[model samples]
Target: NASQEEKFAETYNETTAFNNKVDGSAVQLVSDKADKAKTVDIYEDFSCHYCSQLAKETDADMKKLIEDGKVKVNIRTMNFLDKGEIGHSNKAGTAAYTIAKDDSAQVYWNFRTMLMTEQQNIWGKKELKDLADMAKILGAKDETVKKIADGTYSDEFKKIADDNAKKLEKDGDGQVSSPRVFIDGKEIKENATWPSQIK
Candidate 1:
């Protein structure tokens, strides 16, 4: 029997591949995608507590950036902390991608915060759909809620996660870790200083 973590990642790989084969955009970043002042690339994985807290602390600021459009926060969600085992990072990414695309950007960020805040119960018991339902409670649109419940888009969710992992390896020079921040092409030291470093 595989661990829940393994199963979670497995689902992500399967769904993501499916999305790539088809012409669906369910797994794409789905929110504001233009460049004005600058773009920040954030390599986020649901593997580390520090990463989660750091993201949590910066959520308000990050949301502001995405909403402002003057600064774009590109979340390069990945699962680089597999640690030789099935990881849940990619699984979380799959769900987040779905909401980011189909659901409003506000809901997406809210879901991210919600998931990270309750990351423990997620993979320990396969709480993806449960989380989706909970997001609607926070005010996700009806259509987006249906999108989350469709279960068909799970594949699309996986494709983007797969792409994100591949890009991290190829473009990021094989660097695999959580909370990697790059601002205006300059990699920001992913630590507590991330909030202040952003300009």
Candidate 2:
């Protein structure tokens, strides 16, 4: 019942308990009233431009849906963009997962959003210390900061990437791409208007 700008401002200014849960390799954001909410699986890569676009355009609304108990989102982050090597994408993905696993969901969400928003700036960043520093600046705990700095979750990121790639391939009819969305187990095209359409 509000204008788009109003909704954006409201979400931006509000602090709701958008709880985050970890299931295997995915980080699930759920609301307290999400007992019957539909699950939306989102496969993304930290280095994918389209993935960043999806995050920027839809994540705020998605956050609202989770806050309202309308839908829970499982973000399965992948590192396939690293191309079978440990690169910026892999490091960023590992750092994000570390935060998701060890820190508060709100911190993790903000961290992930920061990575997506600054994708270009950090696309080719190769220093673990640099990424770790960013994590620290964004409220990640010392333990999470150390893991990211030491590349403790690099292998885990690779494994998650492989698993997510296979699932994306199977779901996409042999096509694999980042920023793919599946609501209730069915793939849907992601666009600016997609999040508001979820019910």
Candidate 3:
């Protein structure tokens, strides 16, 4: 099955098509005059326990800095957890990326929050179709959003994943570890806090 590139491509295309239909933005940039701040790029896996812990535990200070225009955090999600038939993690990551492309960065954050908050209950649920339903609950139209949540945007997701893998290979000693935080191109050490670590 490792040689089944065609099957992989088919699944990827289906996911992307579905994502293109979602509406109302994906990621939210919360910083004031965020365009002027020095940005930090975070490469993470959505299903990573440490990444979720960082979001849940250190977000308050991070949010404060973001709101104050001291920093801008851009997250790139990878589906490295999608080994075997456990494709839900990959699907979820793809859905998040599709929402970001269709809607806005803020929408992606909302989806991330939803997933993190319900991690214990929703891990590997493969119920991404419900994301569109959740968007409706949050007052977002389902037209574009449903496409993302329904696996129609799978191709785009695969592209992003492939691109990220290549980038990591080129920059990360050929290793693709999750939660790779780069502060202006410098790799951050593990368990280190940002902004606070800057000074």
**Which candidate leads the pack in TM-score?**
2
| TM agreement with the true structure for every prediction | 0.70, 0.88, 0.74
- Clash numbers, per candidate: 3, 0, 40
lDDT of 2: 0.79
By TM-score, rank the candidates, best first.
2, 3, 1
Residues 1-199 of candidate 2: C-alpha lDDT, one tens digit per residue: 1132223222323354788767876788888888689888899998999999999988779888998899988898887787878887888888888888788887788778877877886688647887787777666799989999998877887887788888778777688777788888888864556686675
lDDT per residue, candidate 3, 1-199, as tens digits? 1233223223222111111122221132445445466656666677777777767765556656666666666666667877634375676776676666666444555566665555555567646566555544433446656775667777766666666666666766678877677666677776347758643
Provide the overall lDDT of each model, using Cα atoms, as 2-decimal numbers.
0.56, 0.79, 0.58
**In terms of lDDT, which candidate is stronger, 1 or 3?**
3
Q: Model 2 Cα displacement at 181 (Å)?
A: 0.6
- For candidate 3, the lDDT comes to 0.58
Candidate 1 on 1-199: residue-level lDDT in tens? Answer: 2243333322222111101111232222222443464656666776667778887687666555544454555676666564534346645665566667665555565566766766766654444565456556656677766666555456664565566666556656677666676667676765556656645
What lDDT does candidate 1 reach at residue 173? 60
Q: Candidate 3: where are CA atoms >4 Å away?
A: 1-32, 84-86
Ranking by lDDT: 2, 3, 1
TM-score of 2: 0.88
Give the clashing residue pairs of candidate 1, or none.
Answer: 15-155, 16-158, 16-159
